[PDB]
């Protein structure tokens, strides 16, 4: 809608955007290798990661003002920025989920 | 007023993202040496106490030939 309608949002919408791109990709990436293995065998993974994930909707809860299916993107840039003190948490994830891809 | 967006005095520390899967040196071969060696134990073990309950086995023989009769 933006590129046929001729407008450009924000820098700081757009990094959001990239942010919450990425970490939604993580999402959609967890999913796909963990629910991989349970249908295959392997009953465990699947929780180990998918706490983690739980811990993602934890985030999103904050940001949109609800779990999932959340919006939170508009034409023309996102709207209702970050609560205060969001950035925290998401760096405290970010920092150990290397450790827990790793196991 | 001041603004009140996140960012805080750059930088967040360091992250790390790169893959780690290490440290495994128990393994040469010398696990085999290990295990076949712990077979190794076995054998002479088991060896005696088989050579023991032979002994057994002669003396009981002997008990029942001496009752025999």
């Known amino acids: 809608v933006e590129k046929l309608l001729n407008i450009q949002p924000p820098p700081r919408a757009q990094w959001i955007r990239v942010l919450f791109g990425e970490i939604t990709r993580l999402l959609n990436h967890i999913m ?72 | 007023k001041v603004k009140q967006d996140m960012p805080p005095v750059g930088g967040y520390g360091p992250i790390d993202y790169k893959r780690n ?19 190794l134990f076995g054998y002479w073990s088991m060896m005696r106490w088989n050579r023991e309950r032979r002994r057994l086995q002669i003396e ?8 025999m009769p």
């Open chain 1, 32 to 103: 796909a290798v963990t629910t991989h293995a349970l249908d295959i065998g392997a009953m465990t993974p699947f929780f180990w990661m998918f706490e983690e994930r739980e811990k993602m909707f934890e985030f999103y809860e904050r940001v949109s003002g609800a779990r999932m299916h959340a919006a939170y993107v508009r034409p023309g840039g996102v709207h209702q920025d970050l609560p205060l003190g969001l950035m925290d948490d998401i760096y405290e994830f970010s920092k150990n989920f290397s450790l827990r891809i790793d196991e």
């Open chain 2, 60 to 67: 009981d023989f002997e008990a029942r030939i001496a009752l």
């Open chain 2, 21 to 39: 899967l290490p440290r495994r040196g128990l393994s040469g071969y010398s696990m085999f040496a290990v295990g076949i060696g712990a077979l």
